[PDB]
């Protein structure tokens, strides 16, 4: 069949089909993915006046994120139950092109929303020291929308040009290992002069934000990260490509949200953790 | 037909078919089932302010907890519908393949919201004694994880592998026994220092608890009760399946939620019952 | 064609077929049931502050049900839409078995809430003299759960058994001349230590409560009331009953809360009619 | 091809069917309607607050009215899209009966709701003089009933049979005509006693309410203001019909309750506008 | 095949198609759009606090252009995916007319909301001083709904003729610059008297503006503006054409209220950013 620049698991589809398990489990994995999403909006928005007013930016930068990834999680749940049909002859599901090939592209355009607002809600909790406010806002921006856009390029083409799908996928490497460097930096003069607690909360984010948003990478290569015809280029990497999605999203997101929040009430001149 | 690894209902299903009165209670359970969950939501939220402040996120945790049931049961609801379809000749209703398999995995996945929050949110009310916090936080998060993980696994093989089916249940049952363990210890601690009324509220939880989420185990192994090819494996084990999910999935979630509020009011140092 | 256990909708829809104006009005007096819901949800919240503290559980179980009566007469007018296909030929909307068949038990399951929670919610309102409080919610509650679920078997016989329909139809009526037997103790205790102008309004709840809910069995018994092969026993029948489901639902749902709302009101220290 | 009581977009639908800009057109009007609706129910619930207590209301059954009209504009919206389907030889959109002829009477249903709600609301902000309350509210709604149901009998004769068309037209004017005489004597004596801008405000809501109300006759009778084989029995009949419909519905409900909170600022104790 | 006055997206549709790439990243973009919209409906409501009692309209009225910004993308994102289908032979998606044919028409009639209220929204910050507040909101309001009636006459014809395209194109531009010409004056006055922070925001405010409305008129041109046979009378024109509305509307809107909502707060006597 002509797919052109598809994503993998429309070749799996076409090919192969999905057995009950994983087209089922794919299905099961993106559905907890809008449910937390929107169960997380509920609880930033409720917990808003827990912290000091000049905290309360974060907890609506936080719901604002969660709508983004609601929506757009739940957009794709109904991309993966109609781009794939129970096939009765051979008990499979396969690529039902009527439905429209899937694609995890939607995922990165909201990241657009959801990367920029992370990075930026912090600064709305730590005080920087030697660095100013607007330069690592900008700095974040700038970087989070390069990484976001040249990835969206490199991932048409991770089947019909794997040239392409590493090169753009480099490029992007470069931007995350900037925004890493900078989120570090913030990170640690978040830190000075401020209580052992709320030192302990920064440390925990950092080694959050460092694994979720690096399982991000590991998505965008992890059909291949079996190398060629190796396990993970078949349904399992379908199952595990949006499993690592569906964590990333849950740690990157929601659990950031709350430690940040519970940041904030820690520096919270009137509140007590 | 080939099924596979697919949830009793399919064979059913694609074999005799459901009745009219199979398949529209199946469907009504089911609408019942997400239309408490959204009203739910309501109470939960507008009794907000009804207890004291340290008693609040109990209700915010309900509140997020209805979230995902609402959506999780509503999808379901509409997966039932999607699954089989009226055959004129016959006058029953069949397995309809372009419309998914129906699996009650989607349940399973969004329990990972669920078990953890309401095993949370009473350690939000009561006051441990021997215990510390964290630590029963910690065996509730772990323990609930295991169970829903290896019953998940489990449920894909209640027709395609019973050997499978009962090995992964009994894992998960391991699972279970130790948050009835935990929860115990918590209610007992609970009751200690509080007033007669609190302490009757809580022996009503406990027996709720015990009751509603045992019926879970009880809907896994439903097909199975009155042995092979016995009364229940049939339409009329189908409709108990959705009727004691829907009847556990309000006692565990809404009446539990409920409870809680009440214990909140008595022990709330402003207000009255 | 085979039916079976079905409503007496789908043997009209199936045999005459339903004309232009009795298929539209069925779909708009259906379509205007969820809309009053949803306005009726927006009103009982918004008016929550306008009586004091302890009347404010009355509006927040009338949003309650607001939202179980939306989600169910949505539903429902979407399986309306779905269950009869015009056909081009004679100009008549038939039976589209593919939509499923229709059936009015989604509005039976659906009562479980809202029978027991508009029972529930005067004595929220109201003072009890001689009667206990947990001892009308019971009878309430109990009465309530019977008279649905007998009602609900009866009206899946409405054609393929008429006698079964109106046994269970007998038993049904039993349970709900206990629940008016209570209701009018409870209003007679209610008007006791009130203003003339709170008994005034008890006077009216007690009459709209007695027309409004006495017109659901007459929905149920709607075909036959004018005996075998008799007038309504027809589109006419159809439409009849539809109607009388939604003046019967916006009469004990929604008017039944404002009358409690405007009780509270005048027993409110605060506030004036 | 028999219609039977059909509405007139049927006919022009099933005969010449619609251009592009005919179609497109009466599909984005409709759009504007419901999102005008949904914009309107945010404002008003938003701006509650901005009047004294006693006003409130008056935001309130705006609130109301919003959420009927964004419903049924909707629902309506769908109905046009699903009703008429594009023909690739012609190059025309045709009636498509499997989506069910389009009606217009799902308006007149739901008007039910905002004409009682309309008429009651300015009670809540003007204070009569020589007029009884609970008088005005009775003729209001009686004749707002009598003029809604005689027109929705109607217009189901609007092609099928002209004279009952015009007789059941004829009947709804005279309720039309009644409710004019009362809105005018109430808008009357709402001026007695209050600022001049409160008084010039009136004046306004007045012509709007004159103008807008009577933008509907207007569209019931569209097809025919042109006399037989008009230039407005046609696509462009069809075109105007919806936009008249949706002038009327941003007039009558929307601008209207602006400016009774408009009124009820400049009655309000504290407030200034 | 005969399309007649439609949008050129049909007849790249019609003919090419659309490639893997063009059709998936104008259903990302659009879908990215109306998250950016709910994500910005909260962010407004939830900030409504931050600023003094007089500036928060401008919020409400943010939240209210939110809302049809939403609806309208959402909609359009759904009839872009409707519209256009795989062919499984060569591997592009092809216009599916029983989807109807794609019009952008859609967003022009929501104009009618968002730019009368994006105008309107600024007149709440900002004092004029020799101007008058009915007399700028008139001219505003005229010329928005002339601007954007004579372009959507006009956008019928981007294809079918191109004399009535740029003739309307032309007269629409006459109504534009009117009201650049207002706003500049009001952005002048608004900086009379103000803090110089306050004067900064309201200088950028400006060439936001300035550049995401010019954007429109852009988007319009879109095909046409590398001439006939040219780069962009192409997929790739379809994909700019989306892409520039979808940043358009996020600065227009989005990022416009954001800066009107940190000039209140600058202009606020208790508030401080
Ligand atoms: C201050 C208020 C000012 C109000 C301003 C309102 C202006 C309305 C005028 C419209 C006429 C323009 C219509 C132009 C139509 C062009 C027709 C055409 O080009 O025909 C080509 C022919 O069919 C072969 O190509
Ligand atoms: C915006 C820039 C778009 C860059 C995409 C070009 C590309 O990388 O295409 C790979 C290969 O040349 C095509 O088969
Ligand atoms: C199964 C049928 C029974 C379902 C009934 C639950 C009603 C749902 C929400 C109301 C919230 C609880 C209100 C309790 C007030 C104290
Ligand atoms: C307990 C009540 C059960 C009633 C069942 C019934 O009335 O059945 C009628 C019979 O089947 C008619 O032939
Ligand atoms: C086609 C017509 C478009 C209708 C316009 C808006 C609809 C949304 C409703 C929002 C109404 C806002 C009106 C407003 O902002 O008025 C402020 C008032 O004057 C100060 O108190
Ligand atoms: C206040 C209550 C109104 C009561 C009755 C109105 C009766 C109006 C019915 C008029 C029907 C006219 C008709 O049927 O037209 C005759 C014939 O069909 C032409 O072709
Ligand atoms: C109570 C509603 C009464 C409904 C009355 C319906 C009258 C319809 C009518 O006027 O009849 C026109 C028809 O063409 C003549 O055969
Ligand atoms: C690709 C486009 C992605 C855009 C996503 C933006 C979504 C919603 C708006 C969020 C608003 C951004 C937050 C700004 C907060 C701010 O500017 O400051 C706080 C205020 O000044 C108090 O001090
Ligand atoms: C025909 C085309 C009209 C379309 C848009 C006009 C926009 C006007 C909509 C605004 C209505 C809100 C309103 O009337 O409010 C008055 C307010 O008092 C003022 O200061
Ligand atoms: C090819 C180009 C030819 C096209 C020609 C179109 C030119 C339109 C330009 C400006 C319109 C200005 C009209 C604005 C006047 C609106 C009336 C108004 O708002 O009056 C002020 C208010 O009454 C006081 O309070
Ligand atoms: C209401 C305004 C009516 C607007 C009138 C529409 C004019 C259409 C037009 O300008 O088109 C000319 C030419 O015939 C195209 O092929
Ligand atoms: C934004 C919009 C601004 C565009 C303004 C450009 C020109 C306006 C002058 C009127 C143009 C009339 C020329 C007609 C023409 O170009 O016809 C081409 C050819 O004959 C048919 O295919
Ligand atoms: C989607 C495309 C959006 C373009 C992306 C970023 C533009 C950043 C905002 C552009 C205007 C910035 C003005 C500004 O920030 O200055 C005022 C001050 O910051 C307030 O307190
Ligand atoms: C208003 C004009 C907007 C800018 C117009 C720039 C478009 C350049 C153009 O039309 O290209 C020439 C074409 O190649 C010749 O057929
Ligand atoms: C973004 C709009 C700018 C247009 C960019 C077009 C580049 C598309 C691309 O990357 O490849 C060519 C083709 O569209 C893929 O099959
Ligand atoms: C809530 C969403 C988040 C936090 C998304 C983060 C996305 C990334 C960190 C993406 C990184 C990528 C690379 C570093 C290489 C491959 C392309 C990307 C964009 C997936
Ligand atoms: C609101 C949802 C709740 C409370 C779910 C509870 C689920 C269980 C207690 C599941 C138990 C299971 C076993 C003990 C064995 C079979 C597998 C499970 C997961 C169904
Ligand atoms: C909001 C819904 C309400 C108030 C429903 C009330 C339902 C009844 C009073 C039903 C009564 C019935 C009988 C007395 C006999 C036939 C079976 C029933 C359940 C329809
Ligand atoms: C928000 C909806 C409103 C204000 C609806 C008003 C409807 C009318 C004023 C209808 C009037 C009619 C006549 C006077 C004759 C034809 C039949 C009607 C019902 C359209
Ligand atoms: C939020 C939506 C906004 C701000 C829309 C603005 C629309 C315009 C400025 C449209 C301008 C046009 C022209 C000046 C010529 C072509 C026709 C229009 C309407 C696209
Ligand atoms: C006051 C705030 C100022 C914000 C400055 C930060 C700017 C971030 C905007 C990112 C724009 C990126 C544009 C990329 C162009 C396309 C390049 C893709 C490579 C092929
Ligand atoms: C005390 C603990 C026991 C709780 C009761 C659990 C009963 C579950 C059985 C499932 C119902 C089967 C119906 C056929
Ligand atoms: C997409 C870049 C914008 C193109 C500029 C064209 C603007 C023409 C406006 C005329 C008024
Ligand atoms: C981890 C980053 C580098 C991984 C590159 C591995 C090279 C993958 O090689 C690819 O494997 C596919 C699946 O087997 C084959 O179908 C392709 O023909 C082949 O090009
Ligand atoms: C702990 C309770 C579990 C008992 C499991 C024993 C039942 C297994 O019996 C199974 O019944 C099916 C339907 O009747 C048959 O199709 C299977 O072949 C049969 O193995
Ligand atoms: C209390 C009211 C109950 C009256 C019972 C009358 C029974 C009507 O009789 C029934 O009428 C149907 C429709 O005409 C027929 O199709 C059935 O065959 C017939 O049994
Ligand atoms: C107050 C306005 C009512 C005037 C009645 C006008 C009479 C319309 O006449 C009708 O016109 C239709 C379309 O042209 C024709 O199809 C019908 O045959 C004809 O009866
Ligand atoms: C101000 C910008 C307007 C420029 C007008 C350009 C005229 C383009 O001309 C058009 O181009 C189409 C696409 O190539 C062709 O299919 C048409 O035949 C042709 O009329
Ligand atoms: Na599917
Ligand atoms: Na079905
Ligand atoms: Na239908
Ligand atoms: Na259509
Ligand atoms: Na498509």
Redesign the interface.
């Not at 928005?45 to 808003?48: C, D, E, Q, R």
């Not at 049909?85 to 599901?93: A, K, S």
């Given at each position: 069949?002509?797919?052109?620049?598809?994503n993998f698991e429309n070749f799996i589809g076409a090919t192969e089909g999905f057995?009950?398990?994983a087209?089922?489990?794919t299905?099961?994995?993106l559905?907890?993915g809008?449910?937390?999403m929107?169960?997380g909006l509920?609880?930033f928005?409720?917990?808003?006046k827990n912290v000091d007013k000049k905290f309360q930016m974060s907890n609506?930068l936080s719901?604002?994120?969660m709508?983004?990834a609601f929506?757009?999680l739940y957009?794709q749940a109904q991309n993966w139950?109609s781009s794939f049909?129970?096939?009765?002859?051979?008990?499979?599901?396969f690529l039902d092109?009527?439905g429209?090939?899937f694609?995890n592209?939607?995922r990165?355009?909201?990241w657009?929303?959801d990367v920029p607002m992370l990075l930026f809600q912090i600064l709305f909790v730590v005080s920087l020291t030697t660095s100013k406010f607007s330069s690592v806002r900008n700095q974040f921006w700038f970087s989070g929308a390069m990484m976001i856009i040249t990835g969206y390029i490199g991932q048409?083409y991770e089947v019909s040009n794997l040239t392409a799908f590493l090169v753009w996928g480099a490029i992007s490497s470069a931007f995350f290992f900037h925004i890493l460097w900078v989120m570090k930096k913030v990170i640690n003069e978040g830190k000075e002069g401020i209580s052992p607690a709320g030192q302990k909360i920064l440390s925990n984010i950092w080694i959050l934000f460092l694994i979720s948003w690096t399982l991000y990478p590991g998505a965008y290569l992890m059909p291949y990260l079996t190398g060629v015809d190796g396990f993970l280029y078949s349904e399992d990497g379908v199952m595990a490509r949006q499993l690592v999605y569906t964590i990333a999203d849950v740690s990157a997101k929601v659990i950031y949200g709350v430690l940040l929040g519970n940041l904030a009430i820690t520096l919270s001149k009137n509140k007590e953790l």
């Open positions: 069949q002509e797919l052109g620049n598809a057995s009950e398990i087209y089922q489990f299905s099961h994995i559905t907890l809008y449910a937390v929107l169960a509920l609880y928005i409720l917990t808003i609506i719901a604002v994120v709508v983004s929506l757009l957009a139950t049909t129970f096939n009765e002859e051979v008990g499979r599901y092109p009527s429209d090939l694609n592209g939607y990165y355009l909201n657009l929303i048409f």
